């Protein structure tokens, strides 16, 4: 038998976020 990964059980408002932030690229590894 295979499960269907039932429940995380905690709820929230969705809020696809309104106020936007500038998204700097964090590809700063060692150099």
């Amino acid at each position: 038998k295979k499960v269907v990964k039932q429940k995380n059980h905690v709820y929230t408002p969705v809020y696809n976020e309104l106020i936007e932030k500038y998204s700097e690229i964090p590809l700063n590894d060692k150099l």
């Binding site: 500038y22 998204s23 700097e24 690229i25």
Partner: protein, 56 residues
Amino acid sequence: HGYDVSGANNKQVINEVAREKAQLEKINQYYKTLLQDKEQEYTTRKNNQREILETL
């Protein structure tokens, strides 16, 4: 990632016009004809041309 570009260019234009002013002073300093302190035969004739010419 954010435009955010104004106001930091008048300082740069001031820098460009200061380099322009330096080039203009170099060009003005390249002269052989204007004021350069000479012997008395030159300078008395010079001062006389200034004086007679201000009267003219």
